[PDB]
Amino acid sequence: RPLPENEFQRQVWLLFEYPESSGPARIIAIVSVMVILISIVSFCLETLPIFRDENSQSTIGYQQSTSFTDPFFIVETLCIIWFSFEFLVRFFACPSKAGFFTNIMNIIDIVAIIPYFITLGTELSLAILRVIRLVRVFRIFKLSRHSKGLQILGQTLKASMRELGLLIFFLFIGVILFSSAVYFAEADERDSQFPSIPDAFWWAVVSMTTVGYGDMVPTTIGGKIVGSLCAIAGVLTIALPVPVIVSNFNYFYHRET
Amino acid sequence: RPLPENEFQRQVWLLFEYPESSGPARIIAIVSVMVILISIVSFCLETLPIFRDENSQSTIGYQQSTSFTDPFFIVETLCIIWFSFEFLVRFFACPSKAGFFTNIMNIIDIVAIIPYFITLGTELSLAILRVIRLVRVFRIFKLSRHSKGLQILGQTLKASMRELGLLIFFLFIGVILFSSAVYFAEADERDSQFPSIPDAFWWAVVSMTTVGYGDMVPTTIGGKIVGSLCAIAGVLTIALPVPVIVSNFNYFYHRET
Amino acid sequence: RPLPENEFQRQVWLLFEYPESSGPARIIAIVSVMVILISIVSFCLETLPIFRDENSQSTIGYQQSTSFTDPFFIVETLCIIWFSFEFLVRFFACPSKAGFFTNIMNIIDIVAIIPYFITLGTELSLAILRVIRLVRVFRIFKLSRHSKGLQILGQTLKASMRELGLLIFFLFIGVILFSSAVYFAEADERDSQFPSIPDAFWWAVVSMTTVGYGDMVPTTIGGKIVGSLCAIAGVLTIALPVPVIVSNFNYFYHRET
Amino acid sequence: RPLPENEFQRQVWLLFEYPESSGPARIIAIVSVMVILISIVSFCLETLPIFRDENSQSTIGYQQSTSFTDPFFIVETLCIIWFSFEFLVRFFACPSKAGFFTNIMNIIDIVAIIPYFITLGTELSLAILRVIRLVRVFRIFKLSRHSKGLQILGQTLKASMRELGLLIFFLFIGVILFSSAVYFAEADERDSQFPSIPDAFWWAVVSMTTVGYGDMVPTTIGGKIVGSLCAIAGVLTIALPVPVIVSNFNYFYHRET
Amino acid sequence: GPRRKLCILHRNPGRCYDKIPAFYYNQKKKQCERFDWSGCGGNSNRFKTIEECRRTCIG
Ligand SMILES: [K+]
Ligand SMILES: [K+]
16 A cells, blocks of 8 residues: 555554554554444443433433433543544545445444434434344454454455355254244144244244253144254255355465464 | 257257256246246245234135135246246157156156146145145256256265165164154153153154254163164164265266266 | 184184174174163163153063063163173173283173163162162263274373363362352342252362352352452362363374374 | 472372372372362352251351351361362472472362451451352362363363353353344234343343243244344354364364374 | 253244234243244244243243
């Protein structure tokens, strides 16, 4: 990547892009990491009943007001201010403005920055607000800028898209098969825990993944046989694409050194 | 695989066999795929209590009549008519009609076609109808024609028959052993979760596969020791032939490219 | 593999030792396989409450009497007399009688034959009878004679003794660690599900193996952290020796071909 | 390492360092192994309600008195006396006392020795006592001196620190993501088992590891979808660095031979 | 109390439309409570009479 060459844009770009270049760059990287971690902790703690009950305060998790009495709103505002400053500096110092919005890291930053401003504009349909609150957890992906392992995992996911799709397709086929089998095998009972095939989807996904929650369990002998087959076939189906994905991850992992 | 050479059968065979040959072939492939998933969705949704209680419609899932008031029957008959049209075209355009019935991909179509016509002839024994409606789910395998990964999985299953049988045999031996151990270790208890060894088969199969449903759980010290041994032996037994089957799948998966 | 050389002992040894040698040898092998399977089925059905309650019949599962009214006793007697006849033929046709008792495939036959005669002798302590009835399940290992996969598994177990011991040692160390951690982290709770460290051994063994029956579950935050660490460390611990054992099994499996 | 060369320090060092050097050295090694096992058994049995209720004796697990009537305190005193004698001999016979404390094998001895003397000095805050009694279990790590497998595992853990950190980081990211998803997808429910995202952390760690206790289980359709995705992603993120850790373990394991 | 998972479970009325007077053990309340079962689905944390729920969730 070429330097900005402006003699001041280049300095800011080096400061905010390559932490190893200088001491100030390293401290800026550490500050950004700590800010992201603080934002994640605040987002997770907003949902605790201690603050939720003893308080807008539940639809968004923070009270948007000029006074800004709520500590959660203060922390979120500070984190969003830091994120906005960082993104604006990077966008103003990016040598290629046309190609700036193509990198996945900048899209991640924009996704982590939008919901706060969307809520602020709205304050100036309820499921939309819940979805906006839910997508506020995507700032955990802002750590991919400072973590090399996260970048390796992202490259592995990009390269192993076909294997992931094959795993999903095989899982769906097995889930449909075993859900139908267990619904029809355990249908002539009043104590049946499978009311329909779409409900048996939960049992199929739980059994194939070897999770075994136990909330839904077959009772009839045919149900038990179907459950055995579901467990074995789920083990096999999961184990088929996983070695390919792991080989891709190892190739991208040891490529660094 | 050569063309029929009839100057008219060849065109239909190319249209209904090779999607990449032309645009109409691709649109026919997409239509077939959409019909298959529509049939799968209809079959899964026919079991929901919303339509089942507000409805014969419970034994077969649809009402066969000239009026055709039931939407599920309409969807099922449209999917079956498309399947029959495709099968008749493929049978009348196949250059080798003698070898047509040997391919598994055509046996799958025949199996997905038969149960609807069997029910129609019957309405034109109760467990027989239930098992027929169960084997109605085998149209999910009709996606193997349009999906390459499903064909690789089928070839892997064909090639790894001995290893699959070995896995089943080892699982059976371990299940018998640990069911006997857990029954006899926890037999002198007034309230025991294992009435007999055949009922302990369920606990064994959910412990070896590490699903652990929790419906059957050992209580006495000997039962707990047997359960830990069952978990270890089951994970080892499963891990024994899984790498062989995975190697077979990977060989068939990288064979295309 | 020398023949007995008696001109009649050699024929008997060939008949009862090499199934592929002649048609009668294959018939004898199939008959023996069916006899072992029948014995296993009878042993499993002996415990069913249908026959157990509607019957002596509970201490040993069958009633030893001259009339022999119990069908289970008749089946067990037939299987045992076939086993004894086969063992006597093998012992009287073995070229090396001194080394006959060294092969574990014959120790299996003696172990499967003894308990019936032990009960017969004592018919003409209560836990001893239960232990005898438990070791009566070892006739499932008589299939190793007619199964190459079982022999391969036995050779793998013999070769991988050190790895199995290392797996057991690692699992025991992890279980002690996490049982102590979960007992002390959830000790100041009236509703705590861990009465003691030996009782937490069960939770540790089922969590490290990802079985998770759910009977014992941590409740406090420290208990939850301890449980997560236990699960992760158990996955790692089990995953360590398994590739070595699998490599041993693969070497012993592809050696035959 | 060279002998001390004192003609008496060297003899003691060889006696207490190389079990294969002489018969007395093997005797001392077996005695140390048995003493460590006895200490572990006594520590685990101190928590049984048979002795704990029939008792100070609950906060520390033993009662310090001159009479020493409690068998657990007698056993612990003997074990600690042996450990202190062995540590003193090894520290007085170590050729390089400056480098003696750098070895982790002697840090293990010091850590296993301190709690008893700390409680003894206190006899002559309550959570501190619980933490001390928790770290009292680290004498199980004293088996690493007499077992090569534990040394191999320690070297593997030392070499695989980056992969362990990557696994922990990936687990944390997935846990945060799926906890937020399952909380927001199952928030508008009175019977929701996820009061908050930090509470859903337990469900996330249980699902991703596929332990599946079932104490917290999704109910809404979005919850079921999130749970299935959580199981899949947890399986994948466990399977990513485990092969690298396994390769490290195998390299350290076959290096000895 | 650590009883069977049959007891560590939340009430699931089912997917049907009925008000069957069943009894389920609530661990949060540490006791058995009456609830309305729809007549299908549900989980093992379901009993016909309170006597059996108190039997095999308390002892
Ligand atoms: K599980
Ligand atoms: K479970």
